[PDB]
Amino acid sequence: ADSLPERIDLFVSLFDYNSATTSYDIRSIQTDFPTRLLTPDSMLPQTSEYPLKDIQLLYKLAQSCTGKLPLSPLITEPLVFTRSLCKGSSLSPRWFARSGLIHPGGGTYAFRYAEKYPAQFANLLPYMHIQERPNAAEGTLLYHLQNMGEDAINALVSGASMFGSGSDLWLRKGDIYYLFNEETWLTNANKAGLSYSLLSACFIQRGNICWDVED
Amino acid sequence: NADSLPERIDLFVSLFDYNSATTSYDIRSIQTDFPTRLLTPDSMLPQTSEYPLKDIQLLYKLAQSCTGKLPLSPLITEPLVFTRSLCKGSSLSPRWFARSGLIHPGGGTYAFRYAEKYPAQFANLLPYMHIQERPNAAEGTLLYHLQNMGEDAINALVSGASMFGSGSDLWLRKGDIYYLFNEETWLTNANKAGLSYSLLSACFIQRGNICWDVED
């Protein structure tokens, strides 16, 4: 009776793709932005991935440039990085490009290297998290990316047929995303007889229960 | 995680006395009484992803005329047997339903569709119908809980989740058993653990992070 799928099909067909001013090729986003530089969880400490005391040994070495070396093989690459910063040795862009990008403490090797050597910041930008790069100018892809929340990023990474970021609608046609503003979204939604909302926040989910702190 | 939500939920769960639950259900018992495909809400909808489009159309036309071109896909053999049988008016026993895939390509069950043509058999075939095709169960029964749960809770149950909410009750898994607790016990223990809670927001058709509904 409600015919939601036909209504969504009508809604997507009402947009003027060719005349959108802003559009992005998905395959280019993929090539320019490795996924781990987009997802917000990369910015947090990576405790689920390494043994705690090996991380403890690595942090102490980072902070004092002396201490017992961690033995674990998971630590080899972060240890290479930590020794280089202690010893003042250079790391080529090729090193960052063949690394896992993400430092155990959260954020990127490239970003931490360039906090020590700002002369290399521009050169190392393609290996930094989008949340580590400078605030981008209005209208640019980096701008939209930096101001997407976690749900919008995930939809983007997943190639979703549409998603909402900020007040913008992103609509996938073929392998391109076309952007439309809030007012166009509403008018076409109304013409298809539809209402919409962005997915509600759920901080920790267990079954169908959304948990939060009382305060 | 400055809020330590996982450790608060661990506290929360530890506050319940499972002996004092309002009632309890064994997961193995649910599994025996309700084959999963009779629980899931998507079994009630057209099975478009499970068959090729041309064969569904041939099969639909076959059902309405009892003649014409047969769909030939190997997936469609059993639905075709069912379709022929309603056409020719031959009888299907409970044994045939029990040994079938249960779900008709157009949505719903073989048993329900058989019973629409032969209503005298409705009661006898209820164990092979979807829970949304059976009459509403009486208050206090498992089937009543299942019919009134909602989709997300059904999915939580079929996925064996650690806990979920149905209506106002809390279902808490302990081992292989679900224990039900009332909203006042739920709220008290959440309050002791420094936790607030809500059920997942309604989202009838999700595309990306967009939740769609009809403007009524």
UniProtKB/Swiss-Prot annotation, chain A:
Protein source organism: Vibrio cholerae serotype O1 (strain ATCC 39315 / El Tor Inaba N16961)
Mod. after translation: Autophosphorylated. Contains two disulfide bonds that may play a role in the stability of the protein. However, the disulfide bonds are not absolutely essential, as some activity and growth are detected in the absence of each disulfide bond.
Residues of the full protein shown: 38 to 254 of 499
Record topology, Periplasmic segments: 2-215
Subcellular localization: Cell inner membrane
Segment forming the signal sequence: none
Subunit record text: Homodimer.
Effect caused by changing H144A: 1.3-fold decrease in vxrA expression. 6.3-fold reduction in survival following penicillin G treatment
Biological role: Member of the two-component regulatory system VxrB/VxrA involved in the regulation of diverses processes, including virulence, the type VI secretion system (T6SS) and biofilm formation. Functions as a sensor protein kinase which is autophosphorylated at a histidine residue and transfers its phosphate group to the conserved aspartic acid residue in the regulatory domain of VxrB. Is critical for colonization in the infant mouse model. Contributes to the resistance to beta-lactam treatment.
Protein name: Sensor histidine kinase VxrA
Inducers of expression: The Vxr system positively regulates its expression.
Record note on disruption phenotype: Mutants lacking this gene display a significant colonization defect in an infant mouse intestine colonization assay. Mutants show a decrease in vpsL expression and are deficient in biofilm formation. Deletion of the gene results in a 4.4-fold reduction in vxrA expression and a 134.8-fold reduction in survival following penicillin G treatment compared to those of the wild type.
Domain notes: Contains a unique periplasmic sensor domain (SD) and lacks a cytoplasmic linker domain between the second transmembrane helix and the dimerization and histidine phosphotransfer (DHp) domain, indicating that this system may utilize a potentially unique signal sensing and transmission mechanism. Detection of the signal via the periplasmic sensor region may induce conformational changes of the dimer and close the transmembrane helices TM1 and TM2 and subsequently the cytoplasmic DHp domains in a scissor-like mechanism, which changes the activation status of kinase domains.
Phenotype when changing C86A: 1.7-fold decrease in vxrA expression and 4.9-fold reduction in survival following penicillin G treatment
Effect after changing F81A: 1.2-fold decrease in vxrA expression. 3.6-fold reduction in survival following penicillin G treatment
Disulphide-bridged cysteine pairs: C65-C86, C202-C210
